[PDB]
Amino acid sequence: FRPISVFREANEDESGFTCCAFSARERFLMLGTCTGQLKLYNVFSGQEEASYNCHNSAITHLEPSRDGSLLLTSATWSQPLSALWGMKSVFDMKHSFTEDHYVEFSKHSQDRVIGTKGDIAHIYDIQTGNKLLTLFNPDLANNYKRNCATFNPTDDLVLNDGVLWDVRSALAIHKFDKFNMNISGVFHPNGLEVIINTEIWDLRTFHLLHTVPALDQCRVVFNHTGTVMYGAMLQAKSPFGSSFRTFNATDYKPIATIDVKRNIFDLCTDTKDCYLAVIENQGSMDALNMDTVCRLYEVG
Numbered sequence: 001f002r003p004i005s006v007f008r009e010a011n012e013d014e015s016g017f018t019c020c021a022f023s024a025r026e027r028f029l030m031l032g033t034c035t036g037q038l039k040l041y042n043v044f045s046g047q048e049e050a051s052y053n054c055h056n057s058a059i060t061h062l063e064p065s066r067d068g069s070l071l072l073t074s075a076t077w078s079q080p081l082s083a084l085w086g087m088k089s090v091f092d093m094k095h096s097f098t099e100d101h102y103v104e105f106s107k108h109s110q111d112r113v114i115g116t117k118g119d120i121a122h123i124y125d126i127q128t129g130n131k132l133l134t135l136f137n138p139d140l141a142n143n144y145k146r147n148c149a150t151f152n153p154t155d156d157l158v159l160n161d162g163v164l165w166d167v168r169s170a171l172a173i174h175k176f177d178k179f180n181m182n183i184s185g186v187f188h189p190n191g192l193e194v195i196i197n198t199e200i201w202d203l204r205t206f207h208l209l210h211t212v213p214a215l216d217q218c219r220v221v222f223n224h225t226g227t228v229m230y231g232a233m234l235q236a237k238s239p240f241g242s243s244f245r246t247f248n249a250t251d252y253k254p255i256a257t258i259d260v261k262r263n264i265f266d267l268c269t270d271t272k273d274c275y276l277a278v279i280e281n282q283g284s285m286d287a288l289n290m291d292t293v294c295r296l297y298e299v300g
């Protein structure tokens, strides 16, 4: 991990970057801020190229669409709490998700949004904005404090609150046992495995394949090729502590532990898996205000 670039939010006395994603436009990083702004930065110059106020509370999450035409945002205490923005030609709001505190695109064909409201998942059509489907069963809930509903790579399964759902039938096919209080789980890009905190389950047999103690309380991100898994750990200001782990995605063998000595707010990779971007806070949890920097590292 060779540091190649660093920047702080332009002009600000304290720098308020909260989350990041690379744009479909080569060289440009998208960042959310603690004032609900979306900014476009040259990742090498640190030049601010554009600024849009999406929310009147802090951004917690953003996800660009692969074809660069759409963006999802989530905020902290705004109504609406999440939104879908059009980026082709003029930046504008397309739909709003009144109480969903987290949203993602479908993965295969990006024509749907999945939103999370506490223990409940909602699926929406992108063209009409209509809610197609609500996945919730109170007998099956795990009540994960950081529940995030997600699609599998083919868009026909959903993981919500540690329940695996068939999207076509709207049927719960399996409730995974609850072994932590916060992390609800993600699909591996290979479409055969589920990662729920420290447990790696097989989707076809529900055997436990691996225990990875180092993933405890970690939020997991895959590189674009599905060969490396990157993890940063939640705080018992900041959602994460000050270090990140890399794992081999095929055997879950640890490759690296990096302590950046600063609390991490977010990290993401470019679609060619050359660069890792990390939002690190220079201030503590106790400071008046946050003071984040975006650090760009070369990996290979």
Ligand SMILES: COc1ccc(C2(C3=Cc4cc(N5CCN(C)CC5)ccc4C4=NCCN34)CC2)cc1
Pocket (backbone or CB within 6 Å): 018, 019, 034, 058, 059, 060, 061, 076, 101, 102, 146, 148, 182, 183, 184, 218, 219, 234, 237, 238, 239, 265, 266
């Ligand atoms: C499964 O585990 C997860 C843990 C956290 C999250 C979320 C999330 C929340 C968040 C709040 C921030 N705060 C700082 C203090 N300020 C007062 C208000 C805003 C700053 C960054 C982030 C953030 N960045 C990337 C993810 N994420 C909601 C998405 C998702 C999953």
